[PDB]
Amino acid sequence: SWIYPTVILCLFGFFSMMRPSEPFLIPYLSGPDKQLTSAEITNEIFPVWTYSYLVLLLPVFVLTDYVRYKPVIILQGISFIITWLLLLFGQGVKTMQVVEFFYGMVTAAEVAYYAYIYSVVSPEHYQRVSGYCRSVTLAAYTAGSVLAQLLVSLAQMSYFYLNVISLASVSVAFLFSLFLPMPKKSMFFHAECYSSKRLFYWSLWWAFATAGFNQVLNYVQILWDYKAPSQDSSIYNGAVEAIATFGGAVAAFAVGYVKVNWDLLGELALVVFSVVNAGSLFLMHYTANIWACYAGYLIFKSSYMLLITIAVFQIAVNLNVERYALVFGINTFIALVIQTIMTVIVVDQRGLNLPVSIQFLVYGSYFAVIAGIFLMRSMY
Amino acid sequence: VQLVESGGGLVQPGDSLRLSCAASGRTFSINAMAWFRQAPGKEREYVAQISWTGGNTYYAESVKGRFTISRDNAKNTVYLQMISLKPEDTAVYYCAADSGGIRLGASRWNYWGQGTQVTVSS
Ligand SMILES: Cc1ncc(C[n+]2csc(CCO)c2C)c(N)n1
């Protein structure tokens, strides 16, 4: 009884996230197709993603519950098509700002994908099923990225004939998204805890750390293109993304295998791996060798993902399934309020308008200041 | 926008040139203007760019350091200043005015100029 909704919910998850041209985005943008100056991408287009993502988060979170979780899933499917239909033919600098906004709906509606299964699957097969619908996404992204650097290198497929394949992939996602059973009970609508010492402190790092992780992911392909232009030398942005994603996936699984009490050795394991993220972000900025810059991304994603798993594990030890959403819903919002404050000052055109050359000395110093205040706070 | 180019001519090597582009007709919305170039028996080649709202520029790697592009929003014209010319720069230059708005198309540059003849020789 639990296999039909999950089989079609996993098929939708795999196809939607099997997008080959996620890595080859900025090489595609600032190329001979939609030639855009790197100053028109790092300070006018990309920042809009965090502005629209922040705005369309609470309205979508509340909407997902009132109207049962599926209608929002379809909306994410439609926004996937609109985003890649403008990314194919839409040209200009103003048309790309619209694309970023529609990618806010695509990413902000991801809450209704993971939370849907709770309302249609029996409560016993909730962690079993949740793993199935979460590992398929990682296997889809890793499989897609490997294919991107398999057609661009061995098959010679232009960067345009990856948005066509990406469009077909997401276009088939919105064919299974019409077949999920319609839930009949929501969590809050149709169905003080922060005072705990651990749930607040362990949420502060989750909110702050994930705020910088999203920013680094956004303005990273510009750094690769800056240290080695795509029109002059070969770019392995697909293999690097695939290896980094696999590195994070195995790292998160490792935390779920070792049995160590993350209470006496929890804070130390988060200061130490936060230093590694600060140390490996100066490398991406201080190193001229493009290969070293790839390794800096490889270590950062693998190291950071080893901490979001500890923080998520420590946050969720007493909360119910009915409390994760509004305890992981605030943090995913407070994390964005930090990102918008940082993007406005550091990146936005009206702010400091810092280029990408000097930006990573701030992100690399951002994670070195989330270490002193969570290590100098432990005072006796 | 009806871009008109002028200022072409044959110059001995090491002689600069200034090329203007009297953009006119719908100049309220021209969010860029990037000169191009088409050498004899070749294809159009990027040569410069200048934003209209601000002044951000982006020159081609080969031509950077001698080619200076400056907007003149008062009169709408866009000037390309070139120094240290050589007989390998003989080509024809074209403007390309990115009008603006939400559009679907094949090329970012909506409207194009006619073309000015530059013939470096001696
Ligand atoms: C059209 C568009 N697509 C994606 C992003 C954000 N983004 C780009 S790459 C990446 C991680 C994978 O490399 C993320 C989150 C954006 N701002 N605009």
Author numbering:
A (entry chain A): 11 to 201, 271 to 459
B (entry chain B): 2 to 123
How is this structure described in the published paper?
The human SLC19A3 (hSLC19A3) transporter is a twelve-pass transmembrane protein of the Major Facilitator Superfamily (MFS). SLC19A2 and SLC19A3 are the main transporters for thiamine in humans and mediate the uptake of the vitamin with high affinity and specificity (Km = 2–7 μM). Among the known thiamine transporters, SLC19A3 stands out in terms of its physiological and pharmacological importance, as it is crucial for the transport of thiamine across the intestinal wall and the blood-brain barrier.
Nb3.4 stabilises the outward-open state of the transporter, while Nb3.3 and Nb3.7 both bind to its inward-open state. While Nb3.3 and Nb3.4 bind stably to wildtype hSLC19A3, Nb3.7 can sterically only interact with the glycosylation-free transporter. When hSLC19A3 transitions from the outward- to the inward-open state, thiamine undergoes a major rearrangement. It relaxes via its rotatable C-C and C-N bonds connecting the aminopyrimidine and thiazolium ring into an elongated conformation. The aminopyrimidine ring stays coordinated in the same position in the NTD, with Phe56 closing on top of it. Together with Trp59 and Tyr113, Phe56 forms now a hydrophobic pocket that we termed ‘aromatic clamp’. Meanwhile, the positively charged thiazolium ring reorients and is accommodated between the electronegative backbone and side chain carbonyl oxygen atoms of Leu296 and Asn297, respectively. Through the transition of hSLC19A3 to the inward-open conformation, the hydroxyethyl tail of thiamine detaches from the backbone of Ile36 and reaches across to Glu320 on the CTD to form a hydrogen bond (2.7 Å). With this, thiamine tightly connects the two helical bundles of the transporter by non-covalent interactions. Once the transporter changes to its inward-open conformation, thiamine rearranges to form a molecular bridge between the NTD and the CTD, before it dissociates into the cytoplasm.
